[PDB]
Symmetry: D2
Subunit: 295 residues, 4 copies
């Protein structure tokens, strides 16, 4: 037997960092969960009980805190690239670092119409994420994402003209509820190393903001022929607005809300044009995925 692939490291490392502006007194908080996995010439720790090649996962944890102390933690694309590069430069036998970061929302509170200097609220479990793969001699690959964005529209969604056969019971519809949790990922062109990532720093926050805005606007405005059709329009627009993105991937549950026929009770009318009360279904759900790239 042989080791075909191996990676190890520390997961679920929670980090908080505060920045204090001494002039204005304003404070800003960042909170993240970080995972770092390493690869390299480490096979002998598996096959010969040779621990000499192991950077302890506890040390990886220490390194994350030290790196956060000495560097900016925003945008997460930059922080992940700094953290990944550290491991491949510091340790000769480590040739790849894989860094995943989940950023948690701490939104500044407005108290009496003005921004508070040091109080924050978690407005929603929506996350901003990055995956950074730093590979010795192959540069830095970054995938940025948003997830956990839950939306619903109560009309302007249709679904008709699908294949009908002996397995089909679904009725065609020209008016339904559409609800989903959005997971969108944009993959950056490969960067040669940290200098190049630093040169593009302003594009990271701007493109996150654009991806979010395009997603919400298109969802709200499209008279949707299907989830497939609406999600394609989203990805098309993101690719048009940022030339440094190579692909956009969407993964969307279709969370079903079923009509409830109440006619058995005093002829009560609650279907089709008369539908007012629906039953949200926890499961099953549709799952629709697409990866869109350039011609």
């Amino acid at each position: 037997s042989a080791v075909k692939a191996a990676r190890y490291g520390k997961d679920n490392v929670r980090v908080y960092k505060v920045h204090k502006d001494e002039k204005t007194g304003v404070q800003t908080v960042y909170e993240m969960t970080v995972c770092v996995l390493l690869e390299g010439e480490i096979e002998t720790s598996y096959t010969k009980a040779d621990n000499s090649v192991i950077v302890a996962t506890d040390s990886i944890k220490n390194t994350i805190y030290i790196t956060a102390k000495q560097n900016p933690v925003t945008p997460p694309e930059l922080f992940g690239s700094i953290l990944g590069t550290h491991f491949i430069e510091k340790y000769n036998h480590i040739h790849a670092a894989h860094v995943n970061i989940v950023c948690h929302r701490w939104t500044r509170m407005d108290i009496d119409g003005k921004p508070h200097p040091h109080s924050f609220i978690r407005d929603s479990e929506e996350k901003r994420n990055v995956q950074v793969d730093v590979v010795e001699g192959k540069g830095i690959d970054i995938k940025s994402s948003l997830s956990g964005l839950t939306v619903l529209k109560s009309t302007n969604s249709q679904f008709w003209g699908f294949l009908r056969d002996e397995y089909t019971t679904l009725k065609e519809t020209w008016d339904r509820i559409l609800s989903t949790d959005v997971d969108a990922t944009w993959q950056w062109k490969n960067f040669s190393g940290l200098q190049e990532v630093r040169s593009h720093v302003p594009k990271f926050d701007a493109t996150w903001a654009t991806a979010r805005e395009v997603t919400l606007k298109t969802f709200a405005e499209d008279n949707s022929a299907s989830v497939q059709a609406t999600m394609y329009k989203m990805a098309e627009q993101i690719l048009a607005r940022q030339q440094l993105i190579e692909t956009v991937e969407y993964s969307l549950p279709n969370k079903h809300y079923f009509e409830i026929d109440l006619s058995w009770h005093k002829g009560l009318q609650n279907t089709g044009k008369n539908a007012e009360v629906f039953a949200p279904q926890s499961d099953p759900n549709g799952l629709i995925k697409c990866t869109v790239g350039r011609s």
Copy 2:
């Protein structure tokens, strides 16, 4: 042996309702999870296998949808009271109904600075809840609550002057992070029945809004001596602003963020006045509760 207490019913009934304004074209959605448990002369279903006294839980589920179809579902205090009253009036042998409702946020989207007519976003897992107990001949008791409101302040929290003995290791502090998930409940004076609840309908949304506003403002502005002291100030203010509330209860986790001493690494300074990077602790957590009423 004897049946000392018994209640039964249907839990986790998910309901969505849409209102359509034909004039303006604006749609508004409500989504709730409802639990209804009944009590009454039902002991024989337990002791003698006498099912004749059982309103089937499936029928309770049907009743929730029918009631939602025929009545407004907002404010939840009114809807719960209508639903509870139904069971005690309809069934002679049912003498109490206990209705719990969790309201889920669907917030209207703003697209290009204007409110969208039919698209919504789940901005946070904060809930608005009600517990309604309708008891034959004893009226309607309502407890309203908000929960899942997660906040953090990065300074202006202190904790010193506590008891010190041989079990104590905690250092006194004049500057710490304070973070909590707020659970606040206000209990209404007993109402004689549905007519009285209907007469107070405007107070329900207004008092929810006041409770939320007082919580956020007090948390942001108090130079907090302890969670105990800050939470008392919140409850005091709610009671002052709404005379129909008898008690206010707060239950608050103290979610700890620990300093990380990095001095072992190149004399790096990250504690006390130099603290920038902290480790959020998933567990254990403080849990502080208070019920405040009138003199």
Copy 3:
């Protein structure tokens, strides 16, 4: 305004303890999550920012570890009573301690038909729990419970003869699936203090084992007329077997498995006597509760 009720303390304190038999080499592990909340003359910490009355929650955490170090942690009823008594005896102004303990399963592994001296498996998320309330001058009240025991029987469950009216669609049945998650609690007669609890130590594990055995046997053997009827038979038997229990409470979800009519597809027969494939429903669920005590 006045403080009507107040309690505070530390929640989610995870504890592991190992016992090592030096003779045999056998090791035994216990793992628990503990919550301790205190009450007493602590109102001024809320109303006057007087921290002098506060035993810090961090100190409560320390006390839990110290107490576990110096005392047996099994049965949990004894450990909770020791922990609760500590606080009311140590601190003059603390008059009640409320201790909740959740015991996690670590079951000794059998390797090649023999018990391993130091390796364990988590066989199921079933918990054994205790709630201990120690109140100065009113003794020790203990409620013991099991929870998270998930069972299913595929036949020998019926449900017919229930109330039928204009809200009813449920068909009567003489053969259905019955599945539930069992939560059972037995409440002990009040104990005068720690000496009396110690005198009954052997009854705690024996009664837990009896409650579990009665639950499983009755569920498997009863040709169930309803959840109500079957749960009553369980509680009756527990009360008969242990005279020091005052009440038994069961809380049982009825987790529904629905027939699927497949007749629309090539006349496929899958209902009534022909039912083979069912759809488990995540929600809603029935919820049935009973508290049984002595004549």
Copy 4:
């Protein structure tokens, strides 16, 4: 822009099936959660709103129930292969089906030392899983797995001789607790189609049982030099016992249990050889992965 990749289908489809032996009266239940995603010539549903190419996800759901009705659901490797093959043979324009199945434990109850004919218990959240990819003209690729197997050993685990540098604080140890949740996957050699899968049917359950047994025995018996070293020994043995497996992958969290120094309190000794009470850490955790294949 172009569609680079696309797949869609139905997730979280819960299925239960009962088998009834008319002779013996014994019943056996199977419960699964199934996900089916399809790929093929479906790009136009995304790019041109052409729904004619879409097999509705609701129809996929119907197909899962119909297939379960007409075929055995065990072993899951066979059922997944039947389900996947159905879609690629039935629909000319569908060229790949991806089927994931999670099998839930329903273990027959023993009542008074004998197996009950129709009552079952969920003994643990351990799952048996399969991933089946059926690709037109490239056969059937099956990965089988177990997950959610949580174990702990209280001694006979060491970790010393790792890299030490300026980022390292971890002390070497010759005696620690080792606890993990096991995720193990074995990948079968490619099968040409359904006939070949059927020919190997007995190997599926046998190899699952072997993988489980090897995992538990090796964990319990290895005087572990590291998680890396112990997991390699597991994979080596599985590959030796089943020649039709090409690779074995393990993914293991290292769930930390920390010593608690209590010496500050009356010189209490609770570290090193005196350690009895530990604090389980919810996060962070080590994460160690390996894929082992044949020379």
